[PDB]
Design an enzyme around this catalytic site. Structure first.
Site, PDB file in Angstrom:
ATOM      1  CD  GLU A 127      -2.786  -1.421   2.207  1.00 46.95           C
ATOM      2  OE1 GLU A 127      -2.860  -0.564   3.438  1.00 46.95           O
ATOM      3  OE2 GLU A 127      -3.498  -2.688   2.480  1.00 46.95           O
ATOM      4  CG  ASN A 169      -0.609  -6.575  -1.805  1.00 46.07           C
ATOM      5  OD1 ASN A 169      -1.114  -7.253  -2.990  1.00 46.07           O
ATOM      6  ND2 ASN A 169      -1.181  -6.717  -0.741  1.00 46.07           N
ATOM      7  CG  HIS A 205      -9.727  -6.429   0.929  1.00 51.37           C
ATOM      8  ND1 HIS A 205      -9.696  -7.694   1.707  1.00 51.37           N
ATOM      9  CD2 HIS A 205      -8.062  -6.186   1.259  1.00 51.37           C
ATOM     10  CE1 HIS A 205      -8.698  -7.857   2.341  1.00 51.37           C
ATOM     11  NE2 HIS A 205      -7.725  -7.301   1.899  1.00 51.37           N
ATOM     12  CD  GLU A 233      -4.036  -8.050   1.401  1.00 48.95           C
ATOM     13  OE1 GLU A 233      -4.946  -7.522   2.141  1.00 48.95           O
ATOM     14  OE2 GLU A 233      -2.683  -7.950   1.334  1.00 48.95           O
ATOM     15  CG  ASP A 235     -12.161  -9.694   1.785  1.00 46.77           C
ATOM     16  OD1 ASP A 235     -11.384  -9.686   3.055  1.00 46.77           O
ATOM     17  OD2 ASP A 235     -12.242  -8.575   1.238  1.00 46.77           O
TER      18      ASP A 235
HETATM   19  O1  LIG Z   1      -6.268  -9.838  11.327  1.00 43.66           O
HETATM   20  C1  LIG Z   1      -6.382  -8.434  10.672  1.00 43.66           C
HETATM   21  C2  LIG Z   1      -5.932  -8.922   9.236  1.00 43.66           C
HETATM   22  O2  LIG Z   1      -6.865  -9.773   8.292  1.00 43.66           O
HETATM   23  C3  LIG Z   1      -5.922  -7.509   8.296  1.00 43.66           C
HETATM   24  O3  LIG Z   1      -4.861  -7.979   7.090  1.00 43.66           O
HETATM   25  C4  LIG Z   1      -4.935  -6.780   6.418  1.00 43.66           C
HETATM   26  C5  LIG Z   1      -6.201  -6.739   5.576  1.00 43.66           C
HETATM   27  N1  LIG Z   1      -5.982  -5.684   4.579  1.00 43.66           N
HETATM   28  C6  LIG Z   1      -6.855  -4.750   4.067  1.00 43.66           C
HETATM   29  C7  LIG Z   1      -6.578  -3.834   3.309  1.00 43.66           C
HETATM   30  N2  LIG Z   1      -5.087  -4.016   3.164  1.00 43.66           N
HETATM   31  C8  LIG Z   1      -5.021  -5.014   4.100  1.00 43.66           C
HETATM   32  C9  LIG Z   1      -3.554  -5.508   4.444  1.00 43.66           C
HETATM   33  O4  LIG Z   1      -2.652  -5.976   3.352  1.00 43.66           O
HETATM   34  C10 LIG Z   1      -3.776  -6.917   5.475  1.00 43.66           C
HETATM   35  O5  LIG Z   1      -2.435  -7.159   6.109  1.00 43.66           O
HETATM   36  O6  LIG Z   1      -4.869  -6.543   9.036  1.00 43.66           O
HETATM   37  C11 LIG Z   1      -5.100  -6.397  10.166  1.00 43.66           C
HETATM   38  C12 LIG Z   1      -5.602  -7.417  11.179  1.00 43.66           C
HETATM   39  O7  LIG Z   1      -6.074  -7.106  12.323  1.00 43.66           O
END
Ligand SMILES: O[C@@H]1[C@@H](O)[C@H](O[C@@H]2Cn3ccnc3[C@H](O)[C@H]2O)OC[C@H]1O
Length: 312
Positions: A127, A169, A205, A233, A235
Protein backbone atom coordinates in the site's frame (compact mmCIF):
# COMPACT_ATOMS: atom_id res chain seq x y z
CA UNK A 1 -13.09 -31.21 -9.44
CA UNK A 2 -14.14 -32.12 -5.89
CA UNK A 3 -12.30 -29.38 -4.04
CA UNK A 4 -11.12 -25.85 -4.82
CA UNK A 5 -7.52 -27.08 -4.53
CA UNK A 6 -8.21 -29.69 -7.21
CA UNK A 7 -9.80 -27.03 -9.41
CA UNK A 8 -6.81 -24.68 -9.04
CA UNK A 9 -4.23 -27.48 -9.30
CA UNK A 10 -5.92 -28.74 -12.46
CA UNK A 11 -5.94 -25.23 -13.87
CA UNK A 12 -2.23 -24.79 -13.19
CA UNK A 13 -2.81 -21.85 -10.86
CA UNK A 14 -2.63 -21.12 -7.13
CA UNK A 15 -5.55 -20.81 -4.72
CA UNK A 16 -4.38 -19.79 -1.27
CA UNK A 17 -5.72 -18.50 2.03
CA UNK A 18 -4.59 -16.11 4.77
CA UNK A 19 -3.57 -18.32 7.69
CA UNK A 20 -3.70 -17.59 11.42
CA UNK A 21 -1.37 -20.24 12.91
CA UNK A 22 -3.28 -20.24 16.20
CA UNK A 23 -6.38 -21.50 14.42
CA UNK A 24 -4.55 -24.66 13.36
CA UNK A 25 -5.43 -26.09 16.79
CA UNK A 26 -9.07 -25.89 15.65
CA UNK A 27 -9.56 -29.19 13.75
CA UNK A 28 -12.21 -27.97 11.28
CA UNK A 29 -10.10 -24.97 10.37
CA UNK A 30 -7.10 -27.22 9.76
CA UNK A 31 -9.11 -29.73 7.73
CA UNK A 32 -10.31 -27.12 5.24
CA UNK A 33 -6.88 -25.47 5.13
CA UNK A 34 -5.20 -28.80 4.37
CA UNK A 35 -7.55 -29.83 1.57
CA UNK A 36 -8.89 -26.69 -0.11
CA UNK A 37 -5.79 -24.65 -0.92
CA UNK A 38 -2.36 -25.08 -2.52
CA UNK A 39 -0.87 -21.83 -1.24
CA UNK A 40 -0.62 -20.11 2.11
CA UNK A 41 0.14 -16.59 3.33
CA UNK A 42 0.44 -15.37 6.92
CA UNK A 43 -2.49 -13.13 7.79
CA UNK A 44 -0.41 -11.42 10.50
CA UNK A 45 2.55 -13.58 11.60
CA UNK A 46 5.06 -12.16 9.11
CA UNK A 47 4.22 -8.49 9.55
CA UNK A 48 6.66 -6.09 11.19
CA UNK A 49 4.79 -5.95 14.52
CA UNK A 50 4.87 -9.75 14.66
CA UNK A 51 8.52 -10.15 13.65
CA UNK A 52 10.46 -7.21 15.12
CA UNK A 53 8.67 -6.00 18.32
CA UNK A 54 11.78 -4.13 19.52
CA UNK A 55 14.72 -2.83 17.47
CA UNK A 56 16.82 -5.66 16.05
CA UNK A 57 15.05 -8.15 18.31
CA UNK A 58 13.15 -10.74 16.26
CA UNK A 59 10.21 -12.97 17.10
CA UNK A 60 9.92 -15.65 14.39
CA UNK A 61 7.87 -18.24 16.27
CA UNK A 62 4.52 -17.45 14.67
CA UNK A 63 6.06 -16.88 11.25
CA UNK A 64 7.98 -20.14 11.51
CA UNK A 65 4.76 -21.98 12.36
CA UNK A 66 3.12 -20.71 9.16
CA UNK A 67 6.20 -21.65 7.15
CA UNK A 68 6.35 -25.13 8.69
CA UNK A 69 2.66 -25.63 7.90
CA UNK A 70 3.20 -24.88 4.21
CA UNK A 71 6.20 -27.21 4.03
CA UNK A 72 4.38 -29.94 5.95
CA UNK A 73 1.34 -29.78 3.66
CA UNK A 74 3.21 -29.18 0.43
CA UNK A 75 1.80 -25.71 -0.22
CA UNK A 76 3.43 -22.68 -1.82
CA UNK A 77 4.39 -20.04 0.77
CA UNK A 78 3.65 -16.37 0.09
CA UNK A 79 5.35 -13.80 2.32
CA UNK A 80 3.43 -10.76 3.75
CA UNK A 81 4.70 -8.17 4.38
CA UNK A 82 8.17 -6.51 4.83
CA UNK A 83 7.34 -2.82 4.46
CA UNK A 84 3.91 -1.47 5.37
CA UNK A 85 2.68 1.71 7.04
CA UNK A 86 0.27 -0.24 9.26
CA UNK A 87 1.03 -2.57 12.18
CA UNK A 88 4.37 -0.80 12.50
CA UNK A 89 5.72 -0.73 16.08
CA UNK A 90 6.13 2.60 17.85
CA UNK A 91 9.90 2.21 18.19
CA UNK A 92 10.21 2.27 14.40
CA UNK A 93 7.92 5.29 14.13
CA UNK A 94 10.15 7.14 16.62
CA UNK A 95 13.17 6.87 14.35
CA UNK A 96 13.98 9.39 11.62
CA UNK A 97 16.36 9.93 8.73
CA UNK A 98 19.19 7.43 8.37
CA UNK A 99 18.17 5.82 11.63
CA UNK A 100 14.74 5.02 10.19
CA UNK A 101 16.09 3.93 6.81
CA UNK A 102 18.54 1.54 8.47
CA UNK A 103 15.83 0.06 10.68
CA UNK A 104 13.77 -0.54 7.53
CA UNK A 105 16.59 -2.12 5.57
CA UNK A 106 17.65 -4.21 8.56
CA UNK A 107 14.07 -5.38 8.97
CA UNK A 108 13.79 -6.35 5.31
CA UNK A 109 17.14 -8.15 5.35
CA UNK A 110 16.57 -10.12 8.57
CA UNK A 111 13.09 -11.33 7.64
CA UNK A 112 13.92 -12.16 4.02
CA UNK A 113 17.08 -13.97 5.10
CA UNK A 114 15.27 -15.89 7.83
CA UNK A 115 12.64 -17.26 5.42
CA UNK A 116 14.94 -17.58 2.40
CA UNK A 117 14.22 -20.72 0.41
CA UNK A 118 10.88 -21.18 2.18
CA UNK A 119 8.93 -18.06 1.26
CA UNK A 120 8.64 -18.14 -2.53
CA UNK A 121 7.33 -14.58 -3.02
CA UNK A 122 7.28 -11.40 -0.93
CA UNK A 123 4.96 -8.43 -0.60
CA UNK A 124 8.08 -6.28 -0.26
CA UNK A 125 6.08 -3.06 -0.14
CA UNK A 126 2.39 -2.88 0.74
CA UNK A 127 0.00 0.00 0.00
CA UNK A 128 2.47 2.66 -1.14
CA UNK A 129 -0.10 4.60 -3.17
CA UNK A 130 -3.24 6.64 -2.53
CA UNK A 131 -6.78 6.52 -3.86
CA UNK A 132 -6.86 9.32 -6.42
CA UNK A 133 -3.26 8.75 -7.46
CA UNK A 134 0.14 9.58 -6.04
CA UNK A 135 1.83 8.33 -2.87
CA UNK A 136 0.07 7.40 0.38
CA UNK A 137 -0.25 10.37 2.74
CA UNK A 138 -0.31 8.65 6.15
CA UNK A 139 2.77 6.43 5.75
CA UNK A 140 5.80 6.66 8.04
CA UNK A 141 7.97 5.43 5.19
CA UNK A 142 6.74 8.05 2.71
CA UNK A 143 6.92 10.83 5.34
CA UNK A 144 10.35 9.96 6.72
CA UNK A 145 12.07 8.65 3.58
CA UNK A 146 10.33 10.06 0.51
CA UNK A 147 9.76 8.44 -2.89
CA UNK A 148 12.92 6.35 -2.93
CA UNK A 149 12.02 4.04 -0.06
CA UNK A 150 10.22 1.60 -2.38
CA UNK A 151 13.27 1.09 -4.60
CA UNK A 152 15.45 0.86 -1.50
CA UNK A 153 13.21 -1.83 -0.01
CA UNK A 154 13.18 -3.90 -3.18
CA UNK A 155 16.95 -3.74 -3.75
CA UNK A 156 17.47 -4.72 -0.11
CA UNK A 157 15.08 -7.66 -0.53
CA UNK A 158 16.93 -8.94 -3.61
CA UNK A 159 20.24 -8.43 -1.79
CA UNK A 160 18.99 -10.72 0.96
CA UNK A 161 17.10 -13.23 -1.22
CA UNK A 162 18.50 -13.64 -4.77
CA UNK A 163 15.64 -15.76 -6.13
CA UNK A 164 12.43 -14.85 -4.30
CA UNK A 165 9.66 -13.22 -6.35
CA UNK A 166 9.51 -9.61 -5.12
CA UNK A 167 6.01 -8.14 -5.29
CA UNK A 168 4.41 -4.77 -4.65
CA UNK A 169 0.86 -5.07 -3.24
CA UNK A 170 -2.11 -2.69 -3.04
CA UNK A 171 -5.89 -2.20 -2.98
CA UNK A 172 -8.34 -0.10 -5.00
CA UNK A 173 -6.02 -0.85 -7.91
CA UNK A 174 -8.13 -3.65 -9.38
CA UNK A 175 -9.59 -1.30 -11.97
CA UNK A 176 -7.83 1.23 -14.20
CA UNK A 177 -7.80 4.49 -12.23
CA UNK A 178 -5.45 7.17 -10.85
CA UNK A 179 -4.17 4.84 -8.13
CA UNK A 180 -3.46 1.85 -10.39
CA UNK A 181 -2.06 4.20 -13.02
CA UNK A 182 0.51 5.56 -10.59
CA UNK A 183 1.25 1.97 -9.54
CA UNK A 184 1.59 1.19 -13.25
CA UNK A 185 4.19 3.93 -13.80
CA UNK A 186 6.27 2.69 -10.86
CA UNK A 187 6.34 -0.90 -12.12
CA UNK A 188 7.25 0.22 -15.65
CA UNK A 189 10.00 2.48 -14.25
CA UNK A 190 11.43 -0.34 -12.13
CA UNK A 191 11.55 -2.90 -14.93
CA UNK A 192 13.00 -0.20 -17.21
CA UNK A 193 15.91 0.49 -14.85
CA UNK A 194 16.54 -3.05 -13.62
CA UNK A 195 15.17 -2.47 -10.12
CA UNK A 196 14.29 -5.95 -8.75
CA UNK A 197 10.52 -6.42 -9.15
CA UNK A 198 8.79 -9.63 -10.29
CA UNK A 199 5.13 -9.35 -9.34
CA UNK A 200 2.18 -7.09 -8.59
CA UNK A 201 -0.57 -7.96 -6.13
CA UNK A 202 -4.17 -6.79 -6.35
CA UNK A 203 -5.75 -7.29 -2.92
CA UNK A 204 -9.33 -7.26 -4.17
CA UNK A 205 -11.10 -6.40 -0.92
CA UNK A 206 -14.35 -5.89 -2.80
CA UNK A 207 -17.98 -5.15 -1.98
CA UNK A 208 -20.77 -7.43 -3.19
CA UNK A 209 -22.03 -6.29 -6.56
CA UNK A 210 -18.97 -4.21 -7.28
CA UNK A 211 -16.28 -5.91 -9.37
CA UNK A 212 -14.26 -3.73 -11.76
CA UNK A 213 -15.32 -4.56 -15.30
CA UNK A 214 -11.83 -3.67 -16.49
CA UNK A 215 -10.13 -5.92 -13.94
CA UNK A 216 -8.83 -8.30 -16.63
CA UNK A 217 -7.66 -5.47 -18.87
CA UNK A 218 -5.82 -3.93 -15.93
CA UNK A 219 -4.17 -7.23 -14.98
CA UNK A 220 -3.11 -7.71 -18.58
CA UNK A 221 -1.38 -4.34 -18.97
CA UNK A 222 0.69 -5.03 -15.84
CA UNK A 223 1.43 -8.57 -17.01
CA UNK A 224 2.64 -7.02 -20.26
CA UNK A 225 5.25 -4.92 -18.43
CA UNK A 226 7.04 -8.20 -17.81
CA UNK A 227 5.80 -9.13 -14.34
CA UNK A 228 3.48 -11.71 -12.81
CA UNK A 229 0.17 -10.68 -11.29
CA UNK A 230 -1.96 -12.15 -8.50
CA UNK A 231 -5.19 -11.61 -6.56
CA UNK A 232 -3.77 -11.55 -3.02
CA UNK A 233 -6.45 -10.73 -0.43
CA UNK A 234 -9.80 -11.53 -2.03
CA UNK A 235 -13.00 -11.20 -0.02
CA UNK A 236 -16.32 -9.66 -1.01
CA UNK A 237 -18.22 -8.10 1.90
CA UNK A 238 -21.99 -7.58 2.18
CA UNK A 239 -24.41 -6.00 4.62
CA UNK A 240 -25.09 -8.70 7.20
CA UNK A 241 -26.99 -10.84 7.72
CA UNK A 242 -26.79 -12.64 4.38
CA UNK A 243 -29.71 -13.80 2.26
CA UNK A 244 -30.24 -15.75 -0.98
CA UNK A 245 -29.79 -12.80 -3.34
CA UNK A 246 -26.65 -11.42 -1.63
CA UNK A 247 -25.04 -14.87 -1.61
CA UNK A 248 -25.87 -15.31 -5.31
CA UNK A 249 -24.38 -11.93 -6.22
CA UNK A 250 -21.31 -12.65 -4.09
CA UNK A 251 -20.90 -15.98 -5.87
CA UNK A 252 -21.08 -14.21 -9.23
CA UNK A 253 -18.51 -11.69 -8.01
CA UNK A 254 -16.11 -14.42 -6.92
CA UNK A 255 -16.54 -15.90 -10.40
CA UNK A 256 -15.70 -12.63 -12.18
CA UNK A 257 -12.55 -12.16 -10.10
CA UNK A 258 -11.28 -15.68 -10.67
CA UNK A 259 -12.16 -15.52 -14.37
CA UNK A 260 -10.24 -12.27 -14.86
CA UNK A 261 -7.19 -14.03 -13.43
CA UNK A 262 -7.77 -17.11 -15.54
CA UNK A 263 -7.93 -14.78 -18.57
CA UNK A 264 -4.41 -13.44 -17.94
CA UNK A 265 -1.68 -16.02 -18.56
CA UNK A 266 0.70 -14.46 -16.04
CA UNK A 267 -1.87 -14.31 -13.25
CA UNK A 268 -0.40 -16.79 -10.78
CA UNK A 269 -3.69 -17.30 -9.02
CA UNK A 270 -6.06 -16.15 -6.31
CA UNK A 271 -5.63 -15.94 -2.54
CA UNK A 272 -8.64 -15.39 -0.27
CA UNK A 273 -8.14 -13.40 2.93
CA UNK A 274 -9.26 -16.14 5.29
CA UNK A 275 -11.29 -19.34 5.30
CA UNK A 276 -14.42 -18.74 7.37
CA UNK A 277 -16.65 -15.73 8.02
CA UNK A 278 -16.37 -16.48 11.71
CA UNK A 279 -12.80 -15.12 11.75
CA UNK A 280 -12.86 -12.64 8.85
CA UNK A 281 -11.30 -9.24 9.60
CA UNK A 282 -14.21 -7.44 7.92
CA UNK A 283 -16.82 -7.13 10.71
CA UNK A 284 -14.34 -5.58 13.16
CA UNK A 285 -13.51 -2.83 10.65
CA UNK A 286 -16.81 -2.27 8.83
CA UNK A 287 -19.78 -2.23 11.29
CA UNK A 288 -22.63 -4.27 9.86
CA UNK A 289 -20.56 -5.59 6.96
CA UNK A 290 -19.30 -9.16 6.70
CA UNK A 291 -19.99 -12.65 5.30
CA UNK A 292 -17.24 -11.92 2.79
CA UNK A 293 -15.56 -15.34 2.67
CA UNK A 294 -16.15 -18.72 1.03
CA UNK A 295 -17.13 -20.58 4.23
CA UNK A 296 -19.71 -19.30 6.73
CA UNK A 297 -19.32 -19.13 10.53
CA UNK A 298 -20.21 -22.82 10.81
CA UNK A 299 -17.79 -23.84 8.06
CA UNK A 300 -20.54 -24.62 5.59
CA UNK A 301 -19.62 -23.92 1.96
CA UNK A 302 -21.39 -20.84 0.60
CA UNK A 303 -22.48 -20.65 -3.04
CA UNK A 304 -19.23 -18.76 -3.73
CA UNK A 305 -17.54 -22.17 -3.41
CA UNK A 306 -19.19 -23.59 -6.55
CA UNK A 307 -18.53 -20.34 -8.41
CA UNK A 308 -14.79 -20.55 -7.70
CA UNK A 309 -14.63 -24.19 -8.79
CA UNK A 310 -16.33 -23.21 -12.05
CA UNK A 311 -14.08 -20.25 -12.79
CA UNK A 312 -10.96 -22.43 -12.41
O1 LIG B 1 -6.40 -9.68 11.36
C1 LIG B 1 -6.38 -8.51 10.56
C2 LIG B 1 -5.85 -8.87 9.16
O2 LIG B 1 -6.81 -9.67 8.47
C3 LIG B 1 -5.57 -7.62 8.34
O3 LIG B 1 -4.96 -7.97 7.08
C4 LIG B 1 -4.89 -6.83 6.25
C5 LIG B 1 -6.24 -6.70 5.53
N1 LIG B 1 -6.10 -5.60 4.63
C6 LIG B 1 -7.05 -4.77 4.09
C7 LIG B 1 -6.48 -3.84 3.29
N2 LIG B 1 -5.16 -4.03 3.28
C8 LIG B 1 -4.93 -5.09 4.08
C9 LIG B 1 -3.53 -5.71 4.41
O4 LIG B 1 -2.72 -6.02 3.30
C10 LIG B 1 -3.73 -6.99 5.26
O5 LIG B 1 -2.54 -7.28 5.97
O6 LIG B 1 -4.69 -6.74 9.05
C11 LIG B 1 -5.27 -6.27 10.29
C12 LIG B 1 -5.49 -7.45 11.23
O7 LIG B 1 -6.09 -7.00 12.44
Amino acid sequence: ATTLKEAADGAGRDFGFALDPNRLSEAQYKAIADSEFNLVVAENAMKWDATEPSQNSFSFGAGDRVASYAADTGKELYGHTLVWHSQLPDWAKNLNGSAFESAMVNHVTKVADHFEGKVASWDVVNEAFADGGGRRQDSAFQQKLGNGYIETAFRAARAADPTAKLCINDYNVEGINAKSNSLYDLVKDFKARGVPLDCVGFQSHLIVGQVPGDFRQNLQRFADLGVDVRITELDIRMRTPSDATKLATQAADYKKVVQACMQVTRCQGVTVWGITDKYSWVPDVFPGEGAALVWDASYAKKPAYAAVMEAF
